[PDB]
Design an enzyme around this catalytic site. Structure first.
Site, PDB file in Angstrom:
ATOM      1  N   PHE A  59      -5.443   5.841  -0.063  1.00 41.72           N
ATOM      2  CA  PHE A  59      -4.505   4.736  -0.154  1.00 41.72           C
ATOM      3  C   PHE A  59      -4.640   4.020  -1.495  1.00 41.72           C
ATOM      4  O   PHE A  59      -5.754   3.811  -1.977  1.00 41.72           O
ATOM      5  CB  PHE A  59      -4.809   3.644   0.889  1.00 41.72           C
TER       6      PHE A  59
ATOM      7  N   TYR B 203       0.849  -1.181   0.000  1.00 38.09           N
ATOM      8  CA  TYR B 203       0.000   0.000   0.000  1.00 38.09           C
ATOM      9  C   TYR B 203       0.875   1.217   0.000  1.00 38.09           C
ATOM     10  O   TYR B 203       2.056   1.127   0.333  1.00 38.09           O
ATOM     11  CB  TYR B 203      -0.836   0.016   1.300  1.00 38.09           C
TER      12      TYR B 203
ATOM     13  N   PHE C 299       2.666   9.560   2.659  1.00 41.11           N
ATOM     14  CA  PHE C 299       3.161   9.741   4.037  1.00 41.11           C
ATOM     15  C   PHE C 299       3.825   8.407   4.506  1.00 41.11           C
ATOM     16  O   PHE C 299       4.631   8.433   5.407  1.00 41.11           O
ATOM     17  CB  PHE C 299       2.073  10.198   5.042  1.00 41.11           C
ATOM     18  N   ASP C 300       3.483   7.264   3.891  1.00 42.02           N
ATOM     19  CA  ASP C 300       4.095   5.940   4.230  1.00 42.02           C
ATOM     20  C   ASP C 300       3.766   4.923   3.122  1.00 42.02           C
ATOM     21  O   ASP C 300       2.696   4.990   2.513  1.00 42.02           O
ATOM     22  CB  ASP C 300       3.554   5.359   5.560  1.00 42.02           C
TER      23      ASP C 300
ATOM     24  N   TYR D 298      -7.880   8.569  11.448  1.00 47.46           N
ATOM     25  CA  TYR D 298      -7.373   9.053  12.701  1.00 47.46           C
ATOM     26  C   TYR D 298      -8.062  10.231  13.363  1.00 47.46           C
ATOM     27  O   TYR D 298      -7.548  10.785  14.329  1.00 47.46           O
ATOM     28  CB  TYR D 298      -5.859   9.292  12.578  1.00 47.46           C
TER      29      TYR D 298
ATOM     30  N   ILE E  85      -7.064   0.719  10.575  1.00 53.75           N
ATOM     31  CA  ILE E  85      -8.170   1.676  10.672  1.00 53.75           C
ATOM     32  C   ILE E  85      -9.492   1.172  10.073  1.00 53.75           C
ATOM     33  O   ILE E  85      -9.473   0.290   9.265  1.00 53.75           O
ATOM     34  CB  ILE E  85      -7.818   3.027  10.026  1.00 53.75           C
TER      35      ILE E  85
HETATM   36  C1  LIG Z   1       2.776   5.553  12.438  1.00 47.41           C
HETATM   37  C2  LIG Z   1       1.870   5.170  11.285  1.00 47.41           C
HETATM   38  C3  LIG Z   1       2.403   4.642  10.083  1.00 47.41           C
HETATM   39  C4  LIG Z   1       1.520   4.268   8.935  1.00 47.41           C
HETATM   40  C5  LIG Z   1       0.054   4.442   9.070  1.00 47.41           C
HETATM   41  S1  LIG Z   1      -0.939   4.017   7.796  1.00 47.41           S
HETATM   42  O1  LIG Z   1      -0.241   3.599   6.637  1.00 47.41           O
HETATM   43  O2  LIG Z   1      -2.033   4.910   7.807  1.00 47.41           O
HETATM   44  N1  LIG Z   1      -1.473   2.554   8.143  1.00 47.41           N
HETATM   45  C6  LIG Z   1      -0.688   1.200   8.216  1.00 47.41           C
HETATM   46  C7  LIG Z   1      -1.147   0.463   6.829  1.00 47.41           C
HETATM   47  S2  LIG Z   1      -2.788  -0.179   7.317  1.00 47.41           S
HETATM   48  C8  LIG Z   1      -3.571   1.215   7.217  1.00 47.41           C
HETATM   49  C9  LIG Z   1      -3.050   2.216   8.474  1.00 47.41           C
HETATM   50  C10 LIG Z   1      -3.320   1.588  10.024  1.00 47.41           C
HETATM   51  O3  LIG Z   1      -4.357   1.100  10.147  1.00 47.41           O
HETATM   52  N2  LIG Z   1      -2.262   1.526  10.813  1.00 47.41           N
HETATM   53  C11 LIG Z   1      -2.305   0.735  11.986  1.00 47.41           C
HETATM   54  C12 LIG Z   1      -0.893   0.451  12.514  1.00 47.41           C
HETATM   55  C13 LIG Z   1       0.132   1.520  12.270  1.00 47.41           C
HETATM   56  C14 LIG Z   1      -0.293   2.707  13.133  1.00 47.41           C
HETATM   57  C15 LIG Z   1       1.584   1.062  12.678  1.00 47.41           C
HETATM   58  C16 LIG Z   1      -3.185   1.403  13.155  1.00 47.41           C
HETATM   59  O4  LIG Z   1      -3.731   2.641  12.946  1.00 47.41           O
HETATM   60  O5  LIG Z   1      -3.305   0.829  14.132  1.00 47.41           O
HETATM   61  C17 LIG Z   1      -0.465   4.984  10.345  1.00 47.41           C
HETATM   62  C18 LIG Z   1       0.448   5.350  11.429  1.00 47.41           C
END
Ligand SMILES: Cc1ccc(S(=O)(=O)N2CCSC[C@H]2C(=O)N[C@@H](CC(C)C)C(=O)O)cc1
EC number: 5.2.1.8
Length: 107
Positions: A99, A26, A36-37, A82, A56
């Site tokens: 995404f 992704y 951003f990632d 978020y 999320i």
């Molecule tokens: C620090 C960070 C890095 C990437 C992303 S993201 O790509 O949006 N990101 C990770 C790819 S899955 C879609 C989303 C997410 O659901 N992240 C998880 C774990 C993450 C936080 C480890 C969560 O919110 O619990 C969110 C936050």
């Protein structure tokens, strides 16, 4: 909520079962379209169990609709991501996220 638009179609038949592990690549972007990632930047896919709340709400519902081999754009409202808090250091408060997600395999 979350809106899905297909970039490349998947097989149209293999959909994730609740709790099944989804392996994906992704790239997440803010509304200005800037990444951003991205798991592609690490050359390693990211994995999660559908419905276990590891990701999320936008992903929990968006990926549920996808089939193996599909690559799609998921546009997610802040409350499905978020919200007012954002995630310090990468995602600002009140951010709508876009995404590019490719469902590579279901285990
Ligand atoms: C620090 C960070 C890095 C990437 C992303 S993201 O790509 O949006 N990101 C990770 C790819 S899955 C879609 C989303 C997410 O659901 N992240 C998880 C774990 C993450 C936080 C480890 C969560 O919110 O619990 C969110 C936050």
């Amino acid at each position: 909520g979350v809106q899905v638009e297909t970039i490349s179609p998947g097989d149209g038949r293999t959909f994730p079962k609740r709790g099944q592990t989804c392996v994906v690549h992704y790239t997440g972007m803010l509304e200005d379209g800037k990444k951003f990632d991205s798991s592609r930047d690490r050359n390693k896919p990211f994995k999660f169990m559908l419905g276990k709340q590891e990701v999320i709400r936008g992903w929990e519902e968006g990926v549920a609709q996808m089939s193996v081999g599909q690559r799609a754009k998921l546009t997610i409202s802040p409350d499905y991501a978020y919200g007012a808090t954002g995630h310090p250091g990468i995602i600002p408060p009140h951010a709508t996220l876009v995404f590019d997600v490719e469902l590579l395999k279901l285990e």
